[PDB]
Write a protein that binds this ligand. Sequence first.
Ligand SMILES: O=c1nc(NO)ccn1[C@@H]1O[C@H](CO)[C@@H](O)[C@H]1O
Ligand SMILES: O=c1nc(NO)ccn1[C@@H]1O[C@H](CO)[C@@H](O)[C@H]1O
Ligand SMILES: O=c1nc(NO)ccn1[C@@H]1O[C@H](CO)[C@@H](O)[C@H]1O
Ligand code: NA
Ligand code: NA
Ligand code: NA
Lengths: 533, 533, 533
Amino acid sequence: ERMCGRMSDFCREHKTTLRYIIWGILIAGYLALVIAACVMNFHRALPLFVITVVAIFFVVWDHLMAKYESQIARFLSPGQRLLDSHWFWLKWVIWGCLILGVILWLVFDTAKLGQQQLVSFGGLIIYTSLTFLFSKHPTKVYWRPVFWGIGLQFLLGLLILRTEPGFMAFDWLGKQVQTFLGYSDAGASFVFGEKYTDHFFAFKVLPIVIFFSTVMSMLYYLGLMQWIIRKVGWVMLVTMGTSPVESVVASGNIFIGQTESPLLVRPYLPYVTKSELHAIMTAGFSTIAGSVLGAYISFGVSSSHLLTASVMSAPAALAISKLFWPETETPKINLKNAMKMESGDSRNLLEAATQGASSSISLVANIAVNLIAFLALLSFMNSALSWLGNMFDYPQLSFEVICSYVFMPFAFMMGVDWQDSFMVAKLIGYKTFFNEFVAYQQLSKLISLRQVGGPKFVDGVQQYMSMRSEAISTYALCGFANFGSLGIVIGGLTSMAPSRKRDITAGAMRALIAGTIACFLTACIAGMLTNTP
Amino acid sequence: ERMCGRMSDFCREHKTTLRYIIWGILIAGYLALVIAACVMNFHRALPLFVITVVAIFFVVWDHLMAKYESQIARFLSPGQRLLDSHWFWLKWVIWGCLILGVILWLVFDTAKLGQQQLVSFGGLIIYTSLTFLFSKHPTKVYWRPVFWGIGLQFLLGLLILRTEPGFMAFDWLGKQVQTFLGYSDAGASFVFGEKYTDHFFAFKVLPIVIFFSTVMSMLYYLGLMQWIIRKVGWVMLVTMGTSPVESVVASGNIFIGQTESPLLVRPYLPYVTKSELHAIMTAGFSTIAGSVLGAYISFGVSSSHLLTASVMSAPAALAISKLFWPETETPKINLKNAMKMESGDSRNLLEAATQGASSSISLVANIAVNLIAFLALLSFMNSALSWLGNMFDYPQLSFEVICSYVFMPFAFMMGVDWQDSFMVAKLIGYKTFFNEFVAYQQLSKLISLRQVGGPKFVDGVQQYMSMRSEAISTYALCGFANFGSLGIVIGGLTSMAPSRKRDITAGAMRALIAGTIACFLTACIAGMLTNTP
Amino acid sequence: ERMCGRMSDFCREHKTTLRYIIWGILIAGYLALVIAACVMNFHRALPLFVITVVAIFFVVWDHLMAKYESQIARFLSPGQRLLDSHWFWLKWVIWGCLILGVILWLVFDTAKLGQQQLVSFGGLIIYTSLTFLFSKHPTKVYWRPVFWGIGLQFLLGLLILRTEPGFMAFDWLGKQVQTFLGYSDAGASFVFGEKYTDHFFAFKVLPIVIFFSTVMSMLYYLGLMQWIIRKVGWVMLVTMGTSPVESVVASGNIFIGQTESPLLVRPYLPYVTKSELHAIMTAGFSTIAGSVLGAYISFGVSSSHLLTASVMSAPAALAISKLFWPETETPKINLKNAMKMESGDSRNLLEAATQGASSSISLVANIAVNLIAFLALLSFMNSALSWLGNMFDYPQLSFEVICSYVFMPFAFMMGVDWQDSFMVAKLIGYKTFFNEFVAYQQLSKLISLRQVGGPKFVDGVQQYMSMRSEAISTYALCGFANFGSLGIVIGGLTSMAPSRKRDITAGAMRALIAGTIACFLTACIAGMLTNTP
Ligand SMILES: O=c1nc(NO)ccn1[C@@H]1O[C@H](CO)[C@@H](O)[C@H]1O
Ligand SMILES: O=c1nc(NO)ccn1[C@@H]1O[C@H](CO)[C@@H](O)[C@H]1O
Ligand SMILES: O=c1nc(NO)ccn1[C@@H]1O[C@H](CO)[C@@H](O)[C@H]1O
Ligand code: NA
Ligand code: NA
Ligand code: NA
């Protein structure tokens, strides 16, 4: 077998120069395909060209930043020294300019839009003040992250809701998700037959969750999710001055659930401070997961609003966390250790797809069973309250009626008009007590009723509300914050970090409240930036 | 933050006087609501007043018994001494009075009712004699628990089946369960749609199990289940003289399954004797769980009979256990340790609801899969037997035909007439070989056929039987005693108590047989107390 | 209790003579039933008589072989010595006779059948040559097992496909499975109702898997599966000269899955060589399980072909394994330890049935979820390829189109004509990339289209192919070889044998390729033995 030995020797001698050549050939083939498509017709091949251009730009950018990091740092050093020298007097000028800009924006846009937007701004101020008043360490507050997070939220709102480029970009992005969630019908129609629509939720909506979980697992295997997570976390870390671990977890909670996001920094969990753990739990409560995005979109909830709220919930979560539980210790973990994410154990793309598919069984099972139990409990409680109410000639007493008055003030401060505040309060109660699935189902009911166009009032009962109120509710209801989530979060985090069980149990409730407050702040900004139709 | 320190100091100084005042205010509000409802209309508010009165009475009773236990014991001591002094001659008088009462009741009621009731009494005697003959230690029999359990069963039967108060109370109690099992339709119609009735069992009956499991978990969190369990166990312990652990487990098996009832005394399992372990397994085999009560009621089985049999199966189980495996060792565990039940790990009511909902997934999955497999096996076996039978010009051979002759004597001794004994034997075989779900399904078929009113015989084949036979079958079929339950019971108990694996495997079959005998004794009492229509 | 002691003493004294008498009485009763049935009518009772005769013959044979093993070995010794003495010159004569027989069979049958059969023979030769060329140790090849396995495949093909006895026997055997898979409808119609056919796959096909798993568990408890496995493994061990462990696992993979077959030799896994482990994984990839046979038969795939391919895949797997990774070490495990199979933990038949039923939940769940995900991915990929294709005025681009050209040569060498090779290639791609469920679904579509009788071509597109091509595809697609199976096989085997994780991961890909090659060799033999209609 001399030939086999010669082949092995040749492979070992120039292994690097062989795989690199193969990859170069593949890249050349792809580029040839792209250029040929452009030559045959440019307008038809435009998106492929754009994708190729952006990918090339990002690859070159990453290569340059990895290669010339030290030179760039040295080149940026003198400016930082000059700014630090003149800061003691330039800070007042910068702060005054920002305050004047805020005042001018208020006077010339928010006052023009109406009273409800000013009420949204006042509600934002009130929520921040209440978060500060009940803070764990009111005298140890670092105010840089709070202002920077609020400002990042405001900038995102301006870019997405008040400019044609961002509005078009996010409308397109949402429209792509609607097309993408239709592919699960292919499997749903075979496993459950052509009559799979006879049972809409179980046989059409949960398959969307399965498919999205599979796709997310595949993307995590490919390393595309961590690439975006690192960029977002670096932005929030360089602006807000937050710790690398909490920044990474907040950036990852945009796309990942609360029970899986901490796995990004699993090795370093035992050494995190109490403030970082509280921030992790708040970020886990203040966001949703991509797996359940398709279900909410199928209900009828706007995809653009959901994406915008998911993006805006990270800085809000970090700001509310740092204001509700500021850091009094010294962090140990550094940026390099935080930004590395140990990838799963998948040998290829199809194994990752199968692993993502398998993990979705318990998710959908728990969703279905919890929905059944919660709706049965709701029916029983409403019946019991009607039984009690009839003893006072008020058989209309119900859970919705009580929630319409208990949670009304929170909706009013978010900029919802007087009439629709009592209707948003019911959704707030639904989310608080059972989950965000029921609240979004009711919101979809209301949206469909509005779209139909029937009467707004029947027998003195309001049937649907405005579109601005629907948007505010969509922003407010985007979160996994409920009492039931508390225990499972605690158990899973204690499981991941047994040694921190004492600390985990102490901050869970504050993290839940902070997540709620962050969702409400996102809703306040959305309300103050939206006009009245 | 001086204000925060002052508030913390005030909270710490008078923590007891603050929460107590809050609870007092809540109680005052509830009482104000009740009295206002009564004032506005008394007849309409009567049940609320009754519930409040009974709750107040029980609270005061528990407080007094906890406070003045020693004084009451000292006050009762002299009478016990006098009774112990005169017992050596008063025992014969008491026993003769009881025997004379039994003879008079027989002569003047059971003989009037007919022959079948006397046959039921003879069957009870025969079952007790057979249990004694094949006893593990026939010479170590303590006869107090056997007679006391049989007497408690007889008293319960008299109270519930032969008096208007108890009959009305249990009919009302059963009617409340029927109303309560309709609330799961709210969740079933959303998760599975308005067409959830197209698949009756899977999409309407299992949700009832889920909802009942959730409610039971919530009640266990609230501590209401243990309150009733302690009372029942104290009654059976002070009358029958049984050990606290086995009494507690028997009282808990009325509402809880066989695989979860032992958790009430989990810490003390490794130190229980062999007789106590056998009694635990018998009590686990002789009862059902509240989770599956709603399914049987949905089939069409009487709820009152099911509740009565569940209540009556505990003393019967303990008596048959103490007669089939009497105690030859010394018990170690005391009353205080047995009556304390370590509650689960739930921080609030909604977490308990979610935990109860999640645990029901495997239950319903196993139920469905086992039913599928058992029915497929039944079809295959019937086909094979018909194939064999045709070789003798008897293609009618089937599993039902064989069971109608194998188990006929057991039904006859229970007081079922000659004709319907062959039909009850089929249900007995169904329960023995597959489970109690199939037997109750067949019984529901028979009940519906009787209710329709069609011909009782077609082509010489009996279609339905009497209502007394249906009641006897309902009493006899109430149990988790089957060969399949044996292994899972063994595995779970060995799991809970690894050190007792050798002892657990030795008594499981005797416990199963004892559970069957206890169910049959309950059926015998029901048959001897029911009249012929 | 003197009577009890006397009974215990009598039972202990003659325990052996009592159970033996009981068994003798049962056997006498069975024989009396059989003889009475024969007397009443012989033609009607013929199959029962045949079954009894064969069972008696096998029992007597096993008894004699166990009793007189040494005497038979001594009686056979002299002939072996004479053959070993004359072998050095008799081997050439035997080999020449075999080669002449092969040449004569070719010339006088395969050339008569047509060109495609000669192409099948050439493809068999080419696959063997390619397996040898890329062998792990080309210079350590033991050629006895390769030739013996190919010859056993050829003999099985001749017996089953070219003789009336075998053809009738296997047609009858397949027809019995079709009758047997109809019994699950009894359970499926109750759990899911009379409308269970509205969802064909989920509510009719998976119950077949559950029932077959239950039956296989019951048969394993009864010890009937190991009885056949030992016979087949002894045949392959005495002919091919393979190790006992790999022979046993190959014989067991005919009826058992790849994740459960290794349990037959679980204790001895840590001491197996690398070649034996590779052979185990190849045998696990080259066969199917009886649990999923009923689903494929329900789709419309021939049962006789499936059984024949399952039987023929074992020697092919062993030959390809020994040619792709020959043995360079010394085996430690002996025949006695390999042939003993530690049976499960079931106390009776019904416990085994329940255990088999419970284990099927995850199987069906994974099947359904994987099918959903794979079909959604297929739809998305086809849409994306059409999007790309339209940029070159070829919107017909699809996964099927690419596979019809990538895998065409493999189908052509298997003896499929030019036209149908492009259609078999699509099925090959389906099996390779997703699983054998999709490929068999598409094959059932094609078979139904052929059966209908419509036009073979519409608008220049071929709709269905010949029956010989369908048979070849059925033989080729019978296997669990896919990329997704690789990881789960690796994880499960590493789980069973943690100490061999390094060796397990090294041979999995070669085992997968060997399984594919073995399936293709079975297809080549089937094609060369089938005529053109
Ligand atoms: O924990 C979760 N992790 C997820 N990852 O995709 C998805 C859902 N959930 C839980 O399910 C509830 C309803 O969605 C939600 O409140 C949340 O607590
Ligand atoms: O073990 C159990 N524990 C339960 N707790 O609620 C409910 C059911 N079961 C098992 O399911 C079978 C059919 O109900 C029954 O025979 C019993 O063995
Ligand atoms: O591993 C398995 N073991 C089985 N035992 O009965 C049955 C199926 N499977 C897997 O399911 C896939 C599709 O059937 C198949 O490719 C195979 O990988
Ligand atoms: Na998240
Ligand atoms: Na019970
Ligand atoms: Na197999």
